[PDB]
Design a binder for this molecule. Structure first.
Ligand SMILES: *CCC(=O)Nc1ccccc1Nc1nc(Nc2ccc(N3CCN(C)CC3)cc2)ncc1Cl
Ligand SMILES: C=CC(=O)Nc1ccccc1Nc1nc(Nc2ccc(N3CCN(C)CC3)cc2)ncc1Cl
Length: 350
């Protein structure tokens, strides 16, 4: 009693309110457990984050905490509680308490073919969530099936906001083949050509890839390495039009694109011969090569595919947009640590 429960050889020091911990899964500097909450008498998810040796991990922890404490929406995961030591020097890790969900879309797509009904309704919930996120000018930037939690009543919640940023269209440009952090398979084509992923179109692309994946139970663009990802995308979308090329003036990007043999766009109905044609039309508009011609989240919700669920009076938006200065990303990790201490203060003490 009063012990420190181990999860996979890692102490999870969340007693006495939270006990009976079981492993759920891991990310790069994070481990998630389920636990019993003795105060609310229910099982919860607890994420242990140990970020304070790396500036980039600190950036991501603060970013996710600042965003999720300020968001409240049915299709976005909430923060219920945060535990950390009483003093800054003692604080070596942070525990984020969240609603325990049954599964993720990744798991579900590995285990079963979805009906059209389920595909449609998951897509709607993803877009409903994303409307709220984008209404605060926040970009998720890492939407994929494993970042979509699902419970036993088919409720879906978006999670993992560690790579989120504010839409910043004035500084989106970068060079050809610039390094990128988000999961390769869900990266839009422009990430590899001229874009830092600072506009809302990059989340729409990822949602397109998720729809494709829900229709066929496999990733649509599974690149084996950075450039291969672009090549997979162009293999299906075909040779960009001249109008779309003329929006790219990075010389190396254009010359790469212009070196490829001519190829016409593959008909979605040929890749997805047994899918609803309305779903394929929406997929077409989400996976457009040119980010400027890609459908917006509002337009996607209004699309005929989602018509059984579409209800703009029941699709709320955030109070107010958010701002995060570029200079945050240059703060020493000791300063990020103090901001995480501050942001988590309102949940003290145990
Ligand atoms: C939301 C992003 C994130 O933290 N994802 C993640 C990754 C691994 C483990 C847990 C987890 N987060 C949460 N999980 C749940 N519920 C839940 C998710 C996944 C499973 N399975 C474990 C094995 N695979 C990772 C998928 C199936 C079970 C339960 N609830 C809340 C959070 Cl934050
Ligand atoms: C939109 C573009 C597209 O997908 N078109 C295309 C059409 C046919 C085959 C491949 C491709 N594209 C790719 N091809 C390459 N490299 C490559 C270079 C030359 C050739 N030739 C050599 C001689 N030529 C006469 C025919 C084949 C083949 C492949 N890398 C990446 C890709 Cl994505």
């Amino acid at each position: 009693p009063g012990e420190v429960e181990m999860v996979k050889g890692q102490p999870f020091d969340v007693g006495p309110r939270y006990t009976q911990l079981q492993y759920i899964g891991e990310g790069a500097y994070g481990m998630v457990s389920s636990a019993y909450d003795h105060v609310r008498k229910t099982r919860v998810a607890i994420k242990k984050i140990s970020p304070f040796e790396h500036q980039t991990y600190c950036q991501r922890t603060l970013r996710e905490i600042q965003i999720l404490l300020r968001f409240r929406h049915e299709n976005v995961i909430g923060i219920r509680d945060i535990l950390r030591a009483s003093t800054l020097e003692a604080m070596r890790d942070v525990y984020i308490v969240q609603d325990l969900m049954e599964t993720d879309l990744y798991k579900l797509l590995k285990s079963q073919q979805l009906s059209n009904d389920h595909i449609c309704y998951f897509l709607y919930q993803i877009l409903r969530g994303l409307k709220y996120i984008h209404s605060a000018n926040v970009l998720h930037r890492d939407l994929k099936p494993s970042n979509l939690l699902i419970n036993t009543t088919c409720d879906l919640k978006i999670c993992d906001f560690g790579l989120a940023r504010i839409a910043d269209p004035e500084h989106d440009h970068t060079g050809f083949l610039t390094e990128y952090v988000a999961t390769r398979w869900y990266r839009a084509p422009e990430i590899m050509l001229n874009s830092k992923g600072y506009t809302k179109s990059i989340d729409i692309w990822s949602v397109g890839c998720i729809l494709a994946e829900m229709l066929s139970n496999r990733p649509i663009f599974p690149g084996k390495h950075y450039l291969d990802q672009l090549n997979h995308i162009l293999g299906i979308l075909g040779s960009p039009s001249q109008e779309d090329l003329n929006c790219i003036i990075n010389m190396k990007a254009r010359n790469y694109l212009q070196s490829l043999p001519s190829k016409t766009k593959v008909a979605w109905a040929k890749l997805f011969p047994k899918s609803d044609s309305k779903a394929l039309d929406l997929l077409d508009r989400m996976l457009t090569f040119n980010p400027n011609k890609r459908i917006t989240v509002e337009e996607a919700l209004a699309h005929p595919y989602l018509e059984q669920y579409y209800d703009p009076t029941d699709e709320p938006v955030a109070e107010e947009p958010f701002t995060f200065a570029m200079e945050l990303d240059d703060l020493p990790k000791e300063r990020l640590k103090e901001l995480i201490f501050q942001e988590t203060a309102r949940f003290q003490p145990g």
